[PDB]
C-alpha cells in the first residue's frame, strides 16, 4: 500500500492543537525551547501519539459535571470522556484526548443542559492550563465563570474554546506559551506517556510548522500556534495506515496551475516536517498549492535550500 499525503491546501486544512483553520507555513530555529506538543502527533503509518485524537472540534474541549467552589465564581469539572462515558485515568496517556498541550489561559463558554425539563444555560468561562488546579489526568479541571449560582451539579456540562487571554496587559506577548507543556497531573507530579519531543538532526535544517492565529479575547496575548501536522494529515494517516519504507518521505510542494515545484521537505516517520533553511521565515506559497509525496529517501537526504 503506497504512502501519500492528502490533496489539501493550507487554507483548506485545520490546525491540530486548536479548533482553528491553518493560515501559513512558518519555519524557525527551535533551539531555545523544547518542541513537544501532545496534540496533532501522529506517525506516517497511522499510530496516534500523546493526546492526539481524530475530531478537530474536540481539541481543547472538556466534558463532565461542575461543582461550585462556595465563596467564588469558580467551578470544578469532573472530566469524562467525549462519549460522556467515565474517563479512565489509568489509560496509558498523558491526559484525556483533546487536552490543551500548552500553558496559558483559554476563554470559551461553559454550556449546561438540565436532563429533566431540558433547560439550558451558558456562561463565559476561562481555564488556566498552567494553574495548580489544572489536572486533566486526574480528571478534575477548574474553570472561572461569570456567575456563581447558575450551574447545577450532576448535570452534563461542556466547555467550548474560543480564544486565549493575556492576564493584566503587563508584559505583552508572554502568554500563552505554546511550547511549555502544562502539568497534566497538577503540582509536583510530572507527566506520563508523553509524545517524544522533536528536533532537527541534520545540519542546516529546521522545523516546518503549520502556523495559525488563535483568537484573542483580552489583553495582548501571543496568539501564534504552530503544529507539527495538520489535523487532516492525522486523519489521513490514521485512515491509510500505509507502511513506512524509510525514516524520511520526501514531500514536494507543487503548484497545480503550473506544475513547478517550489520547495522540498522531509516528513519523518515519527511525524514532523523538516526544511533546509536557517532563520525565522514565513513561506510565501500559492494559496492553491499542496504537498506531494514522491519517494522514501535517505535518512539524511540533503534537501535543497528553501
Amino acid at each position, epitope marked *: 500500500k503506497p504512502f501519500s499525503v492528502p490533496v489539501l491546501t493550507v487554507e483548506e486544512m485545520t490546525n491540530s492543537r486548536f479548533p482553528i483553520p491553518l493560515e501559513k507555513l512558518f519555519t524557525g530555529p527551535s533551539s531555545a525551547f523544547v518542541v513537544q506538543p501532545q496534540n496533532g502527533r501522529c506517525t506516517t503509518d497511522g499510530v496516534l501519539l500523546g493526546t492526539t485524537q481524530l475530531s478537530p472540534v474536540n481539541i481543547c474541549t472538556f466534558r463532565g459535571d461542575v461543582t461550585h467552589i462556595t465563596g467564588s465564581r469558580n467551578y470544578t469539572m469532573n472530566l469524562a470522556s467525549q462519549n460522556w462515558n467515565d474517563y479512565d485515568p489509568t489509560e496509558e496517556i498523558p491526559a484525556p484526548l483533546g487536552t490543551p498541550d500548552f500553558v496559558g489561559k483559554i476563554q470559551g463558554v461553559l454550556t449546561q443542559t438540565t436532563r429533566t425539563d431540558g433547560s439550558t444555560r451558558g456562561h463565559k468561562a476561562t481555564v488556566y492550563t498552567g494553574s495548580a488546579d489544572f489536572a486533566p489526568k486526574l480528571g478534575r479541571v477548574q474553570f472561572e465563570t461569570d456567575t456563581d449560582r447558575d450551574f447545577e451539579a450532576n448535570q452534563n456540562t461542556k466547555f467550548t474554546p474560543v480564544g486565549v487571554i493575556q492576564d493584566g496587559g503587563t508584559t505583552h506577548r508572554n502568554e500563552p506559551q505554546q511550547w511549555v507543556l502544562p502539568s497534566y497531573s497538577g503540582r509536583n507530579t510530572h507527566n506520563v506517556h508523553l509524545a517524544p519531543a522533536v528536533a532537527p538532526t541534520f545540519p542546516g535544517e529546521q522545523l516546518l510548522f503549520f502556523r495559525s492565529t488563535m483568537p484573542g479575547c483580552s489583553g495582548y496575548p501571543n496568539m501564534d500556534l504552530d503544529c507539527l501536522l495538520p489535523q487532516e494529515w492525522v486523519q489521513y494517516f490514521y485512515q491509510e495506515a500505509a507502511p513506512a519504507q524509510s525514516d524520511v518521505a520526501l514531500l514536494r510542494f*507543487v503548484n497545480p*496551475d*503550473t*506544475g*513547478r*515545484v517550489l520547495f522540498e521537505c522531509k516528513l519523518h516517520k515519527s511525524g514532523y516536517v523538516t526544511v533546509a533553511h536557517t532563520g525565522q521565515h514565513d513561506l510565501v506559497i*500559492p*494559496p*492553491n498549492g499542496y504537498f506531494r509525496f514522491d519517494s522514501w529517501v535517505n535518512q539524511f537526504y540533503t534537501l535543497a535550500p528553501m
Partner: T-cell receptor, first 110, second 115 residues
C-alpha cells in the same frame, strides 16, 4: 484585477526607461508573480522577465524588474533601437487567474 | 523543438459556436498546462483561460469576460488543446494564441506562444 500600464514610454538611445504596472485592491497576499513580455511588430510575445525580477536565458542584462506588492516595474537601461516594441505585464496570484496589462509602446527617441 | 500550431478560426455569426484546436510538438502535452490568450484589434492582450495537467486534477479556469461561455479542454492521445467558444459576441473578434505554462524555471512564465 485590472493592471494599469502607461500607453507609451519614449527615450533616447542609451537612456534608461521605466514602465509601471499598477494593480488594484485585489491584494490576496504575498504571492504576486509579475512577468514582463516583449512583443515586436509581427512577432509573438517573448518572455523577458518572470517572477518579478528573474530573467530567462538569452535575455540581455539590460532588462530588470521589481515588485512592490501590487506595483511591478520594468526597467530598460541603455535603450537601443531594437528595444522599440510593446511590453505587457502579466500578474498571476496563485488562484488560477492570469491578468494582462494594457501594454506600453516603447519607442526610441531621435 | 517546442511548437504550438493553432487552427480552426475564421468567420462565425454572433450567437453561434466555434472550436479552436492547438496542436503541439516537442514535449509531453499531458505534462504542461495550456492557456488561451486573445488579442483584440488594436488593443492589449487578454487572458481567456487555461487548463492544467491531467495528473494534477484536470481542472479549468476562465476569465470573467468569457466565464460560462468558453470551455477549454484537451486530448492527450491526439496531442490537442481545444477551446470551444459558445454563444459568441462581436467583442470576441480577436487573434487567439495558445501558449504553454512551463514548469522548469518559473510559474507564470508563458514560455512559448503559438502563431
Amino acid at each position: 484585477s485590472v493592471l494599469i500600464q502607461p500607453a507609451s514610454v519614449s527615450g533616447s538611445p542609451g537612456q534608461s526607461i521605466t514602465i509601471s504596472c499598477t494593480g488594484t485592491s485585489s491584494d490576496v497576499g504575498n504571492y504576486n508573480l509579475f512577468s514582463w513580455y516583449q512583443q515586436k511588430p509581427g512577432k509573438v510575445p517573448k518572455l523577458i522577465i518572470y517572477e518579478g525580477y528573474k530573467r530567462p536565458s538569452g535575455v540581455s542584462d539590460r532588462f530588470s524588474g521589481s515588485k512592490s506588492g501590487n506595483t511591478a516595474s520594468l526597467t530598460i537601461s541603455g535603450l537601443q533601437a531594437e528595444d522599440e516594441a510593446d511590453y505587457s505585464c502579466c500578474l498571476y496570484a496563485g488562484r488560477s487567474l492570469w491578468v494582462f496589462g494594457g501594454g506600453t509602446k516603447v519607442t526610441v527617441l531621435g | 523543438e517546442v511548437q504550438l500550431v493553432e487552427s480552426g478560426g475564421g468567420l462565425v455569426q454572433p450567437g453561434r459556436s466555434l472550436r479552436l484546436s492547438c496542436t503541439v510538438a516537442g514535449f509531453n502535452f499531458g505534462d504542461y498546462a495550456m492557456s488561451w490568450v486573445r488579442q483584440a484589434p488594436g488593443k492589449g492582450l487578454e487572458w481567456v483561460g487555461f487548463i492544467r495537467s491531467n495528473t494534477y486534477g484536470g481542472a479549468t479556469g476562465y476569465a470573467a469576460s468569457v466565464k460560462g461561455r468558453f470551455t477549454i479542454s484537451r486530448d492527450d492521445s491526439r496531442n490537442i488543446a481545444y477551446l470551444q467558444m459558445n454563444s459568441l459576441k462581436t467583442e470576441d473578434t480577436a487573434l487567439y494564441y495558445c501558449s504553454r505554462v512551463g514548469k522548469d524555471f518559473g510559474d507564470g512564465l508563458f514560455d512559448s506562444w503559438g502563431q
